[PDB]
Amino acid sequence: QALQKYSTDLTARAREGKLDPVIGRDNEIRRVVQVLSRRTKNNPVLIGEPGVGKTAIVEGLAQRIVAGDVPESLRDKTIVALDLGSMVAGSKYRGEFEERLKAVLDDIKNSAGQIITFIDELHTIVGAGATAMDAGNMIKPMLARGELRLVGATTLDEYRKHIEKDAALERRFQQVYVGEPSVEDTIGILRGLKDRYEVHHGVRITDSALVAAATLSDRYITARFLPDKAIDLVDEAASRLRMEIDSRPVEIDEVERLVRRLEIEEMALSKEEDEASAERLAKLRSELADQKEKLAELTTRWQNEKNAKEEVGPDDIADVVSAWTGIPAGRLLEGETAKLLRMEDELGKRVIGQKAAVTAVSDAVRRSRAGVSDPNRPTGAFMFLGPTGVGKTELAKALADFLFDDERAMVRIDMSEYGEKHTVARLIGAPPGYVGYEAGGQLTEAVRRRPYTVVLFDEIEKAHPDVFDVLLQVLDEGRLTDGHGRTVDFRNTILILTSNLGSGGSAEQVLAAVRATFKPEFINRLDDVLIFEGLNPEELVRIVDIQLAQLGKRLAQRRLQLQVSLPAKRWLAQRGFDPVYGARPLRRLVQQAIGDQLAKMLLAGQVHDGDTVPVNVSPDADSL
């Protein structure tokens, strides 16, 4: 009767129909049974990485016993699930734990070998009751004679951290290696599990959902194992769909929540006795109106759809895989097809010229959302080089902004400090046993979180010619391994290597300097090797416009603006001389010609905030 108090009954629940169906894994249950019915030392231990199904096998064995598919020796055996947590509950005295253990062992032995105990995560049995080794090995005499059977299951690396350190007890256990299944098997598993979820959430599930989940959960989420990271997607999709069968769907409930906040802000900002908050209000109202338009449009379209979405499909799974591990995995639902077709002209707002290199980046971004590029290879690996001041770093910063709306979201490393060979260790970590080890790598541990960024290697030509080799595997496929032995995936980042070889020689001399500075097997990894071009006087007026736009945007903090005459706008670009320093002289000239005079006149009255100022050319300089 001690059992009734210190353990539950598994076979009883299997009869009462409370365990999930178990599909496949025939070899494993066969081996478990045949080990479980031998003469001496019959103690199978299911071992293997976490998630691949190790409790599911024991539940399958229980349902199999209830059914009758077992051999003769295992008829009516009444599996029992032990519990060592509720056994050490209150035993602060000297013998209170050994007493309970002896009672349970005696009642297991009194039965005619019927009971089949089952300790889940038996790596906790080692130090059961400590004080001096006495407890947890009182069963060691009964294991050998095979009186109690004890099918248990622990993870693969808590078996050599807790048990293998006890070689006298490992001897009494037989290991059953449970390897993870493939996609074709996971699909079959899901096809039989697609009823409990479909009934718990009042929805229906298409078979395409199962297929797409079992595929995407293997392609993207490279940190868990397969029978589980595929069930999670299905489960979350179903829960979301049931949440939307409530009153309103998403994308209407978000816009109404935004509108309410904008309203409650505009209602309480109106009574502000100020003049600078007048413009800080003049935009809030416009925003509220332009959002209420969208709300009304969505609400009307819902009415049409409802007078003229009830099962999960192969794209809601993509929405989940995008919301978790923010890699975009969708199918271009018309929100951004226009954007990806406008990409070139949109990156033109910040970068000017070098269409030969803008088109090359845009094409690599584009043919990956359409699902055409190599799924196991980086999303693109370019090294664009050319003379200075031309805009290579600028294009790399414009791309990250166009993609994530925050230029500080990309991962940037400056390869000008890696001049010494030994300085490699700061991006792959330090081996075990050395000073900085628990911190892990640095590039690795940044790409391991949010693996959608853009990676930038400035001035690649200045690092020692031995950091070039840590990038071979990184460019050819997405793998790089830190100290702890974990591996990160680069398969969906966009690498970029800005350089400066062959300052202004030719488009042929620079291709003869690259081939002498790099190795034949390293150039072979790259995509197109883009070459940038010097700037023309006609490409420079637009840069003047950009600089003035930025300066005005910065000045608008103090409520100013400038009226620049076209004579001055062309004078500035006329003084952007010397196509040997690119386009920085323009910046320093704008400073030395406008910023200093503006400061002068600004911190001495006469240009008080508010009113704008005009700028006009003079004989030589330009005055205000």
Which residues are at the interface with a second copy (CB under 8 A)? 459, 462, 469, 472, 500, 503, 520-521
> 351 contacts which partner out of ligand AGS, a second copy, none, CB within 5 to 8 A by kind?
ligand AGS
Beta carbons of 354 and 385 less than 8 angstroms apart: no
Cα distance between residue 353 and residue 356, in whole Å: 8
Q: Structure tokens of 429?
A: 């970590």
Sign of CA dihedral 579, 580, 583, 585: negative
Minimum CB distance to ligand AGS smaller for 105 or for 234 = 234
Residue 469 C-beta: closest distance to a second copy, Å:
5
> CA–CA separation, 252 vs 98, rounded Å?
63
78 within 8 A of 115, measured Cβ to Cβ: yes
Binders in 557-586 for ligand AGS, by CB under 6 A: 583-584
Say how far apart CA 177 and CA 331 lie, in whole Å. 39
Residue 48 marked in a binding site: yes
Nearer to ligand AGS, 100 or 229 (CB): 229
3-state SS assignment for residue 184: helix
- Core vs surface per residue 322-353: b (16+ CB within 10 A) or e: beebebebeeeeeeeeeeeeebeeebeebbbb
Strand segments, DSSP code E, in 504-564 are: 562-564
**266 is known to lie in a ligand binding site:** no
From the list a second copy, ligand AGS, none, pick the one residue 322 interacts with, judged by a Cβ distance below 5 to 8 Å according to partner type: none
Q: Which residue has the tokens 């508010």?
A: 610
Could you tell which of a second copy, ligand AGS, none binds residue 441, using a CB distance below 5 to 8 A set by kind?
none
> Distance between CA atoms of 339 and 395, rounded to whole angstroms?
18
The reply on whether position 496 binds ligand AGS by CB under 6 A is no
Distance, in Å, from the CA atom of 446 to the CA atom of 431, rounded to the nearest integer, reads 18
Least Cβ distance, residue 225 to a second copy (angstroms): 24
Cα separation, 489 vs 503, whole angstroms: 35
Q: Which of 543, 544, 572, 590 lies at the binding interface for ligand AGS (CB under 6 A)?
A: 543
Smallest distance from the beta carbon of 479 to a second copy, in angstroms?
13
Known binding residue 387? Answer is: yes
Question: Using the rule CB under 6 A, which residue among 87, 241, 351, 361 binds ligand AGS?
Answer: 351
109 annotated among ligand-binding-site residues: no
Kindly state the smallest distance separating residue 431's Cβ from a second copy, in Å: 12
Which of 189, 216, 383, 560 is the binder for ligand AGS (CB under 6 A)? 189
Q: Binds 227, which of ligand AGS, a second copy, none (CB < 5 to 8 A, cut-off by type)?
A: ligand AGS
Which does residue 597 touch among ligand AGS, a second copy, none (CB within 5 to 8 A, set by kind)?
none
Provide the minimum distance between the beta carbon of 137 and a second copy in the complex, in angstroms, as a whole number: 22
| Pairwise CA distance, residues 302 & 177, whole Å | 53
Measure the CA dihedral 366/520/445/431, to 10°: 160
Binding marks (x or -) toward ligand AGS, 20..49, rule CB under 6 A? Answer: x-xxxx------------------------
Ranked by CB distance to ligand AGS, the top (closest) residue is 53
User: Within 275-391, where are the H helices?
Assistant: 276-307, 316-323, 337-347, 355-369
Annotate each residue in 301-340 with x if it binds ligand AGS (CB under 6 A) or - if it does not, as one string. Answer: ----------------------------------------
Considering beta carbons, is residue 6 or 197 the nearer one to ligand AGS?
A: 197
Q: How far is the CB of 68 from a second copy (least distance, A)?
A: 40
Nearer to ligand AGS, 484 or 587 (CB): 587
Shortest Cβ 196–ligand AGS spacing (Å)? 9
- Residue 187 corresponds to which tokens in the numbers above? 């699909």
Q: Within positions 204 to 233, which residues make up the interface with ligand AGS, using CB under 6 A?
A: 227-228, 231
Min dist CB 500 to a second copy, Å, is: 6
The DSSP code sequence of 389-438 is: TSSHHHHHHHHHHHHHS-GGGSEEEETTSTTSGGGGGGGT---TTSSS-T
Number of residues binding to ligand AGS, judged by CB under 6 A: 34
Binding-site residues for ATP sit at: 48-55, 386-393
